[PDB]
Design a protein around this ligand. Sequence first.
Ligand SMILES: Cc1cc(/C=C/C#N)cc(C)c1Nc1ccnc(Nc2ccc(C#N)cc2)n1
Ligand SMILES: Oc1ccc(C(F)(F)F)cn1
Ligand SMILES: [Mg+2]
Lengths: 556, 415
Amino acid sequence: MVPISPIETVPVKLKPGMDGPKVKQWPLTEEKIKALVEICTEMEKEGKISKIGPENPYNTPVFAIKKKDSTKWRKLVDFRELNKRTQDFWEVQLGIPHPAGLKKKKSVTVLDVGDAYFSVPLDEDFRKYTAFTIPSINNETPGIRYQYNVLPQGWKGSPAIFQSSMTKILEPFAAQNPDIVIYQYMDDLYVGSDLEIGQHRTKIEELRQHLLRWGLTTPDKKHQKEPPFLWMGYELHPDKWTVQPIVLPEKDSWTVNDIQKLVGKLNWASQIYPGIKVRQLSKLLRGTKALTEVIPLTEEAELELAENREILKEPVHGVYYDPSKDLIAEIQKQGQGQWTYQIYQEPFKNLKTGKYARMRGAHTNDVKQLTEAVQKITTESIVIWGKTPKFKLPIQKETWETWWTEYWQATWIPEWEFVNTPPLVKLWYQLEKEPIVGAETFYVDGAANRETKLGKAGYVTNKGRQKVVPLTNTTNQKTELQAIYLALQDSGLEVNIVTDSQYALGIIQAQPDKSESELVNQIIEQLIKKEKVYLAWVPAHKGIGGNEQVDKLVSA
Amino acid sequence: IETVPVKLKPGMDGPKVKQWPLTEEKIKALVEICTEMEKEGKISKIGPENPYNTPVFAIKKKDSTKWRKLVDFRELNKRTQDFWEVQLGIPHPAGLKKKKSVTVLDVGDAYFSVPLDEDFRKYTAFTIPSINNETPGIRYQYNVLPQGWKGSPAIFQSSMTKILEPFKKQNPDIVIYQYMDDLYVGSDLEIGQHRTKIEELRQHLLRWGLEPPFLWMGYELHPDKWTVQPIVLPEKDSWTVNDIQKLVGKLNWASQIYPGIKVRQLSKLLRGTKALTEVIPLTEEAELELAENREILKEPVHGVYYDPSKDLIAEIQKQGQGQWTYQIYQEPFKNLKTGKYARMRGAHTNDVKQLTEAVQKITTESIVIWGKTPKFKLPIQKETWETWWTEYWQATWIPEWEFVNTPPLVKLWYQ
Ligand SMILES: Cc1cc(/C=C/C#N)cc(C)c1Nc1ccnc(Nc2ccc(C#N)cc2)n1
Ligand SMILES: Oc1ccc(C(F)(F)F)cn1
Ligand SMILES: [Mg+2]
């Protein structure tokens, strides 16, 4: 024989304070028992399990399932109970590669390592916890007791221990063959390279010889799977990639669940199909989660769906990453808080696409949303390519500088250039830093009675202009906004406004251009029509002239 | 050489913190650093039976070209037992903040000479990720005291005191304070003298060591020149209605801090409904009230005390043109320090780099004065900060922070 290196075992423990499983083995038909005994006899000959004495107090139930349309039974050891009691492991597969970050490969070979899976031994001190029992015919003898010597399928730790054991084996081969890439998925190794097919197939044989070192055999009859690969919802080709076919169903009436499945497909498609939109369709899912309830599609939802079918009419493909070239990211505003982007290196050849949605919130504006989309794309780009793309943004350089120099928060956008493709992001209003000479000064105030919800809003000016409006179904905060709205309505193009509302200033100093409050939206529309607006704050109830007068008028 | 037993706090598992995205340059640098650390025995590869994790990244200390590995042990430091076994603590030296020069030394490399408790090593696990997760992340744990872990200066304290005994005995007026990986050395000497005592101190370590990659560096402070920000009111000959409104607004805010502030007579100047730009003559009654408020504002705030059992809180305001104001306090309106910066430091067009530098300088001041770091209230959106602060970080410690999403009115009064 040729000596083989053993595969180091991973020490395994149960969670602190817990003991192994002691699950009762139901009874089984005489037919199932005979099948399990033959299966387990084969496994024992192969070294996968071993018979144990009666001292072991642990047990996990075993089942026999009929492999459909066949007379052959299959065994199932149900480790659900042991898994609850097994320690947590490091899971390497949490983050999966995105196809847009892969490199193009001339050749990609697949190797089956299904048999290597059973050369991975289970920690000797943990095997006792995997005990199971085949019931005896008619329950007239003791059941046959086995435990596992290898990683059991369905046990919590098997995926992580298998992968970590294969990786350890493969590390020296990968390190000393930097002209190939190796990726493990399920029971297969995927080996890619840019070598001429002859050299490539030589590397493959060298890899097979390396794996023999550990006694791991790979089928000679080479794998049936070949490019394109169907993998994690993608199609991988040697020089391009895409998502597996997206088929939006036809349906006369839509259910909650159907809309959730539709949006899921649209989200999945949005990573290469440019311009997918889902706001109006996701609006129909607001609040409710009765999976069988039917929702009428708004006319806005039917247009959005009509547009998406058009986008999805024919295949689109992304290209792979070329590390020798810069990454470019271009963003567009779509409306209703929706933003779309493309990431490319050569013009008209996207690596991937995507979208971003306005966060839920009371007030917002386009510049903040653009900034947030940039931060998302930057982070996604670090993940996939390890670097920030250069940005092409629909906002003028002068607009950005005005924004970030005057905004109360620190904000930043990495290297970027203006792309002149409407609609452009702009500043709709800008408040003065100093009072305006010659402009009428409006002192505004409002108040409401907390019980009867009745209030008043109004203003008084240095020219003697005055107004007080009575209001119903209102609050202190609503009347304070209403007062500012009236002053804007009734003033010329330049106006000084004096308020004591800290609430109103928190809103306006955040500079919104769209709001969930129609009152704030009315204020925004008035501000856009002005030439100059200076907003001044004073503390309430301190005898400040002007403010004192109107406070009395509105709290009456 | 023998390990000190270490445990976590009762009923508390190890850190399981996600590794955040790293740029290609930072990954390459960390792979090179960790390959060497592994050869030197400082770290060792680990298996999948270790589920713990702490984020890692890389920085460039101020004024150097070489990458330094930085592990973010903030979570582990919260979960690690407290170290009072030999000493209830190191009473913070109040004289450090009063020296004319204080140099900061990176002595963290010395910690690598002490083994780490075999049973605690698993909790220092970290991952070097790969671009696009194309290869499994490289998993390590520490075999020696790690840089950035609060237990490292505690376990090494006995060894540090012994290394420095000859230098302290020979220079008794020097204040030497250790915080995490940093050594703060304060003197009242002329800087030329000072730099030479610092170099003397390096040799004691080099001598004991027999090489530390960043021990040669030195961050020079001058805390005796640190400036504060009392409340000041304008001195004008012509007061507009708007000027007086802003004055009454600021005085109203000050009255939360100072008891005897009054605005009655100043408000009374605005009687009527006047244009904002109209000039108002001050009455004698208003001038007096104003002068009396000036005098109040020259006194310290009453009942202000530091309590080492309470968190320090740091607030920062962007004032524009590269200027930043900040306040450190434990109770509202009881500021223990206030300040103002103006040096963007290679950041005249990057707000976020400026804020990141401000955070580090404020943390440094907090370490010197009270011996611990404050919790920051940062004027920035979480996503922006989280995306960029690691690109400009140059300290070997990391403070805590939260985010301010509503504009404070108080910005106007610290202007
Ligand atoms: C993540 C990954 C999944 C599969 C596939 C898993 C499955 N099923 C196969 C391989 C080899 C890899 N690993 C890498 C690493 C770097 N570049 C690439 N580029 C690349 C991969 C496949 C094709 C094709 N066809 C083209 C280029 N693949
Ligand atoms: O053989 C079995 C199978 C399942 C069970 C359970 F308790 F889970 F229902 C018990 N004994
Ligand atoms: Mg009022």
